[PDB]
Amino acid sequence: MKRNYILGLDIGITSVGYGIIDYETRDVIDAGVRLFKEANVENNEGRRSKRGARRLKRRRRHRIQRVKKLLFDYNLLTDHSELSGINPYEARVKGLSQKLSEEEFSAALLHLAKRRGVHNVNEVEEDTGNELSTKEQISRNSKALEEKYVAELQLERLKKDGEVRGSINRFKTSDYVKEAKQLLKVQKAYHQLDQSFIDTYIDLLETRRTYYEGPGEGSPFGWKDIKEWYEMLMGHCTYFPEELRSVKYAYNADLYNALNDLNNLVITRDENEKLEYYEKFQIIENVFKQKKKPTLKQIAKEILVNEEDIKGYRVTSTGKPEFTNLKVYHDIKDITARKEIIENAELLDQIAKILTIYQSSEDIQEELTNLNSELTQEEIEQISNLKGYTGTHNLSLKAINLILDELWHTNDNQIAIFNRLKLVPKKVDLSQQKEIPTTLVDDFILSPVVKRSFIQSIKVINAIIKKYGLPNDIIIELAREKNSKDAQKMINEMQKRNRQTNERIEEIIRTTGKENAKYLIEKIKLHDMQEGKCLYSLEAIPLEDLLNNPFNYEVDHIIPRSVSFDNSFNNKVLVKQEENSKKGNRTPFQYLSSSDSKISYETFKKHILNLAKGKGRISKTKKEYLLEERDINRFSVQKDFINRNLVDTRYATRGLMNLLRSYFRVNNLDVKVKSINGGFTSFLRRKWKFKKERNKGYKHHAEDALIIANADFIFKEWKKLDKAKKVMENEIETEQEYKEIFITPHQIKHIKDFKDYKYSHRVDKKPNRELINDTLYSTRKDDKGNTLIVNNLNGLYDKDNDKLKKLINKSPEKLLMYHHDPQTYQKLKLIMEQYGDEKNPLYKYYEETGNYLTKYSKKDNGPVIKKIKYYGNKLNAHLDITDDYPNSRNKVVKLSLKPYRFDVYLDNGVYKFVTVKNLDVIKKENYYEVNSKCYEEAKKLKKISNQAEFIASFYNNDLIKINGELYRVIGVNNDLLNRIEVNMIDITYREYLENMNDKRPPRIIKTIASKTQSIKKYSTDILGNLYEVKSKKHPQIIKKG
Amino acid sequence: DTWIVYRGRTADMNKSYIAEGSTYEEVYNNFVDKYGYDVLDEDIYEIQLLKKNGENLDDYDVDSDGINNYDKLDEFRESDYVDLEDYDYRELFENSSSQVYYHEFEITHE
RNA sequence: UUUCUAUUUACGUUUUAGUACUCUGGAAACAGAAUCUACUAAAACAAGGCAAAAUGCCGUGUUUAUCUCGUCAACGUUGGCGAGAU
C-alpha cells in the first residue's frame, strides 16, 4: 500500500541487495538480494573471436568456390578431371615456365587462392607466443625472396627442411600476386585465356574487405556505406542526440581534461586558491605547449611559488604526480612546428579523428590529402605513422566546447557544471516511460560487470516501486571491487598484510615479555609509522612505555569527524592526552600556530614532509590532512571533505546517480537519491559490531544493504549533519559527539534478528547457449568390442611433461604403439629405463644426444616423433559428426553435450525426466523450436508412455522441490543414470561444507529415478517472493527468442 | 608468495580461458568457479583422487562421462582417502583435453 | 571510465587420399598386411538454418519468474502490448 520507506541498495559484482526501512520507526518492511552469474568480458570475446573465425572460413570457402566456378567457365577445370594426385608446390614451380596440364594448372590456381597471405604488414592482430613476430617474419622472408618467387622458396624448404607448414610460412600478398601473374603470363600462351580472366583471377586472389566496409548485404552487424560507418563506430551522443560522439585523444577533449586538472589544483597564495582565466591561459600555453610531459615542479617554477603549497591533484600508482598532457599537440610539434597547423583547433581535431578511426596508414594519408588544409605532402607521410591514438567513444565535441568555455571563465569542476547546466540524457524520452528504462545503461561506458549490475539494480527498483509504492529516498552503494580477478588479488594482498602485522606483533611479544600487545595492535601500528614521535610535540616515544602505560597515549583524529567523515588509520595518530585535550575539534594548522603546542608549525611541516618521503610511513592523504591550512568552517571546504570521503566519485556510480536523478526530475517525483562511499559502510558495520562472520551465505549482501538505508535515517534525525545531507543528496563537533551520533545501537538489533531474507536467482532460458565442447577426438575399436577415445600425448620433448614416463611404467599397452608398431616401443622403453631418474627422460636424452626419439628404421632415416597417441577411456555420450567426414574407417565424436533443459513426467506413479539437450533446439529465423523428432526419440529412450502426465519443465536456476527440500538446478549431470545437480538456494554448498568443516565433494547431485516422492516447481520474482508455479500441460516448443 | 596464472586455449586457438591463484589448488578452484565445472574433462578431480589412493579406475567404470558407478565412488569417499598434494592439480588441468586442449602455466615468484 | 564492433594472416583438433615408415609372402616385380609415426593435398571445424554465382548471410553475447486476462503482431502457438493474479 502507501507506506513511507527508505530504500537501500548494495550493488555488488555478483549480487544486488535491497532493503526497506520504515521512515518513522526504523522498521524493516522487506529485505532481499537478487543474484546473477558474474558477467565476464571473456564470453563476449568468445562469441566475437569465433564470429571472426566463421567469417574467415566462409570467405576462404567462397573464394575457393568462386575460383572453381571461374575455371569451369574456361574449361580448365571440369567435374571429370581428377585433382587428387597433383602436387601443388611442384606444379607452381613447373608452370613458372614450361607448360602446365589442365589439372596441374587448376590445382595451382586453387592452391594460391586457398592461401593469399597478409596485405597490411602491421594489420595482423595476434600474440607473439610463436617467438617470431609477424613483421619480422615477413622481413626475413622478403630478405630471402629477392630473386626467388614464393613457390621456389616453399619447394626449397620442403626438400631441405622436409616441412612447409608452420610459423615459417607467413608471407605477404604482393609476392603471391607477383607469382600468380608471372605463372599466368606463361600459361596463357598455351591455353585459351583472356585478359578479363587474368584480371578476374588476380582480383579474386588479392581482394579483401577493408575494416570500413564490413560484412555484405543483409547482415545485422553491417552498414551501407562510410557515413553509416562513422555513425556506427561513433554513436549518437546521449547529451545531444543528433550530434555524434568525438574521439578522446582529440585536442579539444585533451584541453578539457587538462583544464579539469588545472581547475582542481589548489595553490596557497595571496590570490585565490583556484587559478583564474588569465593565469590559466598562461599556464596552459607555457607548460602544456612547451614541454611534452608536464610536472608539478614546472608549474611551481612558472608561477614562481612554492611547490609545497600545491594540493589536490591526481597521482599515479607509484606516487609520481600526474598531469594529463596534450599528446596530439606535442606529437604535431615533434614533426612540424609551423604556426598555421598548431593554432587551428578544428584541423587538430580532424587529424585526431582520422588517426583514431583509420587504422591503416595508407587510408590516413589519403584522408588528410582529401582534407584541404595547409599540410604539405612530405609532412603527411610522417604524420601518418603516429600511434597510440585508440579511444573511440568520448563526450561530444559540441558539448565539449560548451564545457570548455565555462571552465576557462570560472574555476568550477565537471560535476557541478553538469548540475548547473542540468544536462539530461536525451536518447530516450524519460517523460513517456512508465518505469526507469534499462536502455540508458547501455550508453555510459561501463565494464560489462557494472552494466549487468546496473540493469539488475534498475529492475529491482522498478519491482519495489511497483510493489510498495514510490520510495522517499534511495541510497546506492557500488562495491569497490571492479571484477572477481580483483576480489581475489585484494583478498590475497590483505591476507599478506595481516600476516606481516601479526609477525610484528609476535616479534614484539617475545621482546616485551607481556601480552598487552594483544589489545594494543592499533597503537603499535601507529607508533612505528610515527617512528615513536609525537607528531604534535616532536618528543620521542619509547615503544615499551606504550605497552606499560597505554593510557599515556591516545589515538587522536587529525581532522574532526563532523567534517572529515574519515575514520581510517590515515586520520589517526598517537598523541599525549594533554596534546589531544588542548587540540580540541580543530585543525593542526591553527593549533601549531597557537602557543599551546611545544613545537612551531614550520618545523612540524618540515618534519612531516621529510618523514612522509622516508620509509613510506606517511600516506599521501595523511600529510594533506596534517597540513590542511584551509579553514574547515568554509562551506566549500566541508563540501570537498564530504565528496572525498563520503560521496562516491567513480564514473560508474555518478552515471547511475545522474540517470536516476534525471528520471525522477523529468517525471516530477520528489525522490532523493544519494550515494555512500565503500569505506563508510565498513566503518558502520564495525562500530555496530555486526561483523561476526562473512560465510553465512548471501544474506551478507542483504544485511549491508539494510545498514546503507539506515544511514539515511541517521542523516535526518540530527540537524548537525543535516546540511551535509543536502550536499550529499544533491556545526563543528567533537569526536565524542560523533560517537554519540553514530555508535548508538538502538533499533539496530532488527538487522540482527530479521531471518526472512528472501533470495532470488536469475533464470537463464537463453537458447543456443553452447552446444558441444570443441575437440574432435577420434576413436578406435578395441578387442572387447567397445570404442575408445584416442587422446594424443603432445610436447613430449618439453622438460616438465612426464606423462609418457608415467604411462610407460604403469600401462604400456595403452600407447597405440605397443601393438600397431612394436619395435618403436622397444626404442622408447630402452630410453626410458636408462634415463629414468629425470622427471622427463626424453628431455635428458635430448640434452646429451641432441636427437629427438626417431621412429625405428633399418636405415635410421625415420621421421621425428612429437605426438604419440594413446587409448584413454571409453565412449558414453557423443555428438557423432562422422557423417561430415567421408568414408571414415573409425568413428569421429565430440563429448559433453551441454543440456538445455529437462522435463519431468509422472508415469505410473514414478517420476522420470527427459533431457532436452541444447543440440535439439534448431533455429529457424527469429523463433527457436525444439526438434520434434529428436525430442520424441529422447522421450522413448526413457521408457515413457504416451499418456504420462506432464509435471514441469526446468531450465537453469529454476527452483525445484524434491521430497520437500528446495534446491536450484544447475543442470543435469548424467541423463542415463537420471542424476540432476542442485546447489542450495541460500548458501553455495561449498560454503555450507566449510561452516561444518565437512570434506564431502562440492556439488550436491540428487537422483529423480526412484524413491522421489515429489518434484514440484517453485519460482521467485526479481524481488524474491517464492510462488509455487503451476505450469502448462504441453512442454514449451517455440521460444520467441 | 607466488602467483600462478593458467592460460588455456581451446583447440582452435580462438576462445581463451584464463584463471589465476596462489597455489595450484587455487588455480583449479577458480577455474571451476569462473568458467564452470565441465570446461575440464568430466569428473577429473575424482579420477585423480581415486588414482592417487591406488584404486583400479576400471572397476568404477571410468567413461568419457567419468565415474559412472556413483554407488562405489561414494564408498571410497567414506574411507579416509589420501588427499591431493597441490602439485597434482597441475596434472588435473593437463589431463583434460575436452575443451582446454592447449594448457600453458606461468609461475611468477615475487 | 575501455565497452561494443570491424577486416586479415598463420597456425591448430580430425578424417580420407597420396608419398615415406614397419612387416610378411618373396629373388621380388610387386602383392599385400598394419593404419603406427612424419610430411602433403583436399575436405569438415560448435548441431544446423537461409540464400542463390553474390568483393555473399546468420549460429557460443547482452536482456528472462510462471500463470493469466483481454489488445495487437508474428503466425495454433509465440510475440509484443497493456491489466491483473499467483
Author numbering:
A (entry chain A): 1 to 730, 743 to 1053
B (entry chain C): 61 to 170
Show the paper's wording:
To elucidate the molecular mechanisms underlying AcrIIA15 inhibition, we solved the cryo-EM structure of SaCas9-sgRNA-AcrIIA15CTD ternary complex at a resolution of 3.31 Å. In the ternary complex, one AcrIIA15CTD molecule binds to one SaCas9-sgRNA complex. AcrIIA15CTD is situated in the cleft between the PAM interacting (PI) and wedge (WED) domains of SaCas9. Notably, the PAM region of the target DNA would also be located within this same cleft between the PI and WED domains of SaCas9. AcrIIA15CTD is composed of five α-helices and a β-sheet consisting of three β-strands. The surface of AcrIIA15CTD carries a significant negative charge and resembles the size and shape of conventional B-form dsDNA. Specifically, the PAM recognition residues of SaCas9, N985 and N986, form hydrogen bonds with AcrIIA15 residues Y130 and D125, respectively, showing that AcrIIA15CTD binding directly blocks the PAM recognition sites in SaCas9. Specifically, the sidechain of D72 in AcrIIA15 forms hydrogen bonds with residue K50 of SaCas9, as well as with the base of G21, which is the first nucleotide of the repeat region in the sgRNA. Notably, mutations of AcrIIA15 residues Y161 and Y162, interacting with the sgRNA and the WED domain, completely abolished AcrIIA15CTD′s inhibitory activity. Taken together, our findings show that AcrIIA15CTD inhibits the DNA cleavage activity of SaCas9 by preventing it from binding to target DNA.
